[PDB]
Symmetry: D2
């Protein structure tokens, strides 16, 4: 009855971090068009996901094109979504003796003041990994875990000897981009 | 007191799949060296992990070097670990109406015989994403989820209308490299 | 028909290696419809590219959807494209003293029978990198270069001591997935 | 003759961008020690490369451990090196009609004020790809190329129609992390 003459998407560009969402809106012309329904699509779906209502969620580093197409007339408009890297901001989770630093998408596990330090860790429902932590050269130890994604659940404990004799710590649970710590 | 004169690492090369392990052995010479301690290290810890006992675990595609160094004398030997891509052999986890195909590290969700299909999923402790599944053009629908890791836990269901009206399927859970299906 | 009534894409599923191409064709319904022009699109452009004439090139591992949309009527059909990874074969490029093995997308540089080996290399218009090659324990050396992609251009030479004294080899050029060598 | 007793790595932590370098140095205890030779190793070589003289180069985002081991004593110390992502800062390379935006490690090719736009590009010694650029909805066009690394050589031109005839722009060359443009 009142045909669509056009569509625009707002915002026309947005930056999100991996795991963050932005709501897009399709503006259909004329404003009294009978059928304002749109299909949302993305040309780079490993970068960004789009819901049936234009909610865009960053999945990985990159820039992609979200398009809205009118059910009436197949007019199409698009926005550019940039998914930005995790900031390299160091977030510390634990105490003076042990814990981890979040450094973008790597975790740096640390044990301070020992004879040796091992790390026991598991990621989501994969297997346990037992590793020797690297000596810094001063009684301190470090071990980087690489390339975590948003939602990755890491269970981890240490075996170390701070003098008395070898002890195991209680397993902690860390969720990538959900567990909070204190900045730099 | 008997000094270490050499070390060999066996096997000298090995291919594993991601999340598969292989036990290396360090042979310290001579057999009656008084210190037979070795440290295991990996030059490429993104690709494979090594335990203090030489258990090497494939983490991601590529080739790396695991070295054994003697505590006595710093004698060194090394092995080549090749971590092989997930095979592209199509495994079906589902039935004739809906489910997924595992195709290497991507999952292709499918719904057959509907007027529309949506997918509701979540990976690990990430947020639920809602997508419209892409029509093939014959009343069937697909939607790929890209780049899963060994242990990644996908929880999912569908909304579709096979004639009588929209219904939701029950929550299913897939664990990447663990959940089994029908190698079709 | 003057009008278009439907479209199907032929083939409906296809697999290529990264680097390879598959021609898609759109079967426009009415056998002899007026306008048989389609728009080709891809929902996973990291994985596969599609030409205006429906040629699909694999860019990176994964599975994606390529759609043809009719100019007349905006009928849409789609094909599933699987891009398989470089198989972890071993291709030798060199002689019995030095060269590299191509192992899927990593290169294993080797020098056999030396008192030390350095590798000097450069990838595309990137900077020169100098590395000490890891000793395997028997006067041989290896060094893996990780995650090369199709068309990556590597210039390399070695400094090693075969006993007589240090020499430099002549620079060689390798082009990833173009330069060939000795299979198995 | 004066032996070795210890080593520290200077600096003990450092951050670079992908493509960039930081010189590490081993401080060997006794500072008059006759043999100050170290071996440099890195545990995550996908992330960062180390020269036989302790120059570390960032190759890919993440955090890794670079170790110095004394030739005399094989005492060892470690530095933590963070490789930070190419910032998602928009650099415009082109003019008001056509060019590209560098947005982290993705390039967004654009053509403004056309009835259609195609992009012809080639990465390094890979194949030339042809793509229909995606219309924004206003007579402008866009097409992202994804996940370039430092030194990647992109040769491109455009076919577009500014109103009265398709024309081809001349070949341009972009060198990722080398070609400069104007920030935002
Ligand atoms: Cl993609
Ligand atoms: Cl690595
Ligand atoms: Mg895209
Ligand atoms: Mg390595
Ligand atoms: Mg896709
Ligand atoms: Mg590391």
């Amino acid at each position: 009855n009142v045909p669509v003459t056009g569509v625009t998407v707002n915002p026309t560009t947005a930056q999100v971090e991996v795991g963050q969402s932005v709501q897009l809106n399709a503006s259909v012309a004329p404003s009294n068009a009978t059928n304002k329904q749109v299909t949302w699509s993305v040309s780079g779906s490993s970068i960004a996901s789009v819901s049936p209502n234009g909610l865009v969620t960053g999945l990985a580093q990159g820039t992609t094109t979200v398009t809205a197409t009118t059910a009436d007339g197949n007019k199409a408009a698009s926005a550019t979504i940039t998914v930005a890297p995790a900031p390299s901001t160091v977030i510390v989770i634990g105490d003076e003796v042990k814990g981890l630093k979040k450094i973008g998408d790597d975790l740096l596990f640390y044990v301070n003041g020992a004879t040796f330090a091992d790390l026991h860790y598991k990621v989501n429902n994969g297997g346990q990994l037992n590793v020797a932590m690297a000596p810094t050269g001063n009684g301190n130890y470090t071990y980087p875990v690489h390339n975590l994604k948003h939602g990755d659940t890491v269970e981890y404990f240490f075996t170390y000897n701070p003098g008395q004799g070898a002890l195991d710590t209680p397993w902690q649970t860390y969720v990538h981009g959900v567990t909070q710590g204190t900045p730099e």
